[model samples]
Target: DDIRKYIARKSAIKIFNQSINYSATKWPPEPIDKNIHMIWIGTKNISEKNIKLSIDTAKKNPDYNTSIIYDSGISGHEGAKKFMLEKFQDSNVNIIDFRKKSYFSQLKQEPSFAYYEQVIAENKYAQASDILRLLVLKYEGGIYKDIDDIQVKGFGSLTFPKGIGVMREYTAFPNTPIAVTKNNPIINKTLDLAVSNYQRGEKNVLKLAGPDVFTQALYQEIPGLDSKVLNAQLYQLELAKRQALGVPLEQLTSAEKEKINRPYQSIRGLSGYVEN
Candidate 1:
């Protein structure tokens, strides 16, 4: 070969991204290990539309490991047991029956939440669920979505910070359907504030320990962080549509009661509380 001196010159080529990828610009919205948790407060062996939607969404994302907590009373219902297993058979879903053993005890450290068992006995399911949900995040950081709010999209596509992410509106309340890391200071503050605000006679569960309490904690803990406000239509619920449907079977007409019980029977012919 003829002797040839080849001089290599490096030129900066700004290789362009055909389109601005919003996803590439941000990190994962949720945490690396997405652990989602939900709660089933009653023993109704029903697979409501919301419950089916929630579980199906979680199962679609293999990265998410979900745990549905149930009380012993509910777990004992043969219909409830059959429904859960058959519905989530192929998914990474764990059925945790809290009645069998004590899964959370952090609430007992405080006076207000100390009577958590009694609260559950009183059938203050919303309040009970609030306390348990916080405790779950306190113990293990993860995303907590209410059974009724279905995940229409995957968490991977979203971009949230390392701390806590809450969709707020009206007030700076952290919509309880949120994601937070374990031992996050904001969550810790929320728990303490919730217990301190608990009054035995408080009838409105929301004020007692719901979004109201959570919002208060958010403002108190991080006054500077702008609580994210989501699209109203996306997160807001109409009063008429959001009516509580907890009428006891005794109060329902025969047809209404049968309709309520149908799902429990349809799913595979089927379908937790901690103390302080």
Candidate 2:
């Protein structure tokens, strides 16, 4: 309690405030393309608090030099619009109504020609991929992530590819926690391929992009398309790259610390850990 009390003191607040502000935190500040954008797609099942938290984190940071957009139009996310409005009714982040967007509207759920494919209604994942591709095609430079994720550092230093970025997968496919990219041609080709495959009655498009065959085709067509693998995969690959890497037990980001998936309030509050 005394430690928290000390942090709340006037002098301590000044230091904390300075560090929290993105402009003053990093010594050699990162370079952010002003045109790049941030996107968060919310599902009906996602928590309203989490959605607000994600948007609030983006809005509060000064060095977050990109625009924020929400895909509140897709099939599974229709209910999120109400929750989104509660937090961003008249906010600066541009709310992209994906259902009404030009690119999405043109695509239609099904193509006209017999040869052309269709976006058959499936679970939430298919809808997510469809909407995400639509956003990338229209907006060009942006990142699409689930509403539960929060921004800790500005993505200024990172040079996101014009392909796709997803958390690494050990088995089937990577989880779509946070995908960063610009206008990806593979997504376009993959969508086209989806239409063609659908016409042939293949319901296996779920892991089409995840499979080696699809990945090879995508790479062959769009050689520039790249992917960034996150989580323990990167740590395993590059442990020697940094003296100490990965989320340390003690130094996890506030958001990471909060996602314990248990009823416990704080790990530091537990009895097992050594106390100061």
Residues 106-190, model 2: lDDT tens digits? 4454342122222223334444444354345334534443444555444343332233443332332232332334445544555
Give the runs in model 2 whose Cα sits over 4 Å from its true position: 1-46, 56-79, 90-93, 102-131, 160-183, 208-214, 221-276
Which regions of candidate 1 are displaced past 4 Å?
A: 1-32, 73-79, 99-113, 157-162, 226-276
Q: How far is candidate 1 from the true structure (C-alpha RMSD, Å)?
A: 19.6
> Candidate 2 — what's its lDDT?
0.41
Clash statistics: count for each candidate: 8, 1
Tens digits of per-residue lDDT, candidate 1, 165-222, equal 6653444444556777778777778777776667445667677667777777766664
The window of 10 residues in a row where model 1 has the poorest summed lDDT is 267-276
TM-score to true structure, per model:
0.62, 0.46
Q: What is the lDDT of candidate 1?
A: 0.55
RMSD of each: 19.6, 16.7
